[PDB]
């Protein structure tokens, strides 16, 4: 990724649309904070549905811009109503469960 | 410490001497890392014999 990076700054790359999953996604950003390119002057675009899925605190206060996608609205009361049920469950039998948060994945399973 | 950099950053200081244990050492690192602005232009001298001792 250093070897990467630079050679996005061969260019000097302002403009980063990333596509990968919210490990591979968690990877990258890790790899931006490394580099430290997340400054304000960047803008990245993650192109999944797991928006909140990521790691969003860690470059909340970077300075570059995010923006996404996110499929799974939490403003809504039948998401709210959910998540009231879906955060009370226990987390040991049912494992990522108790997370306020919840993927997209988990919740298209749920929609099927 | 976002409330205590951009304090920081009304003078806007490239040049930081930190006096620390390296817990608060990387502590302060981390939240260096976590504000991005360790980027070239910055300076920073860590006054500590743990030089190593920290998260190089």
């Given at each position: 990724y250093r070897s990467l990076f630079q050679d996005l700054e061969l260019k000097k790359e302002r403009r980063v649309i990333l596509d990968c999953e919210r490990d591979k996604v968690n990877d990258i950003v890790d790899q931006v904070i490394t580099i430290?390119?997340?400054?304000?002057?960047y803008h990245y675009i993650i192109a999944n549905l797991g928006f909140t899925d990521?790691?969003?605190?860690?470059?909340?206060?970077?300075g570059a811009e995010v923006s996404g996608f996110q499929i799974?609205?939490?403003?809504d009361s039948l998401v709210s109503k959910f998540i009231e049920r879906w955060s009370t469950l226990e987390e040991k039998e049912y494992?990522?469960?108790?997370?306020?948060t919840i993927k997209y994945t988990s919740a298209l399973t749920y929609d099927a």
């Open positions: 430290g390119k997340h400054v304000k002057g990521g790691d969003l605190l860690k470059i909340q206060f970077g799974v609205d939490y403003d494992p990522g469960a108790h997370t306020a």
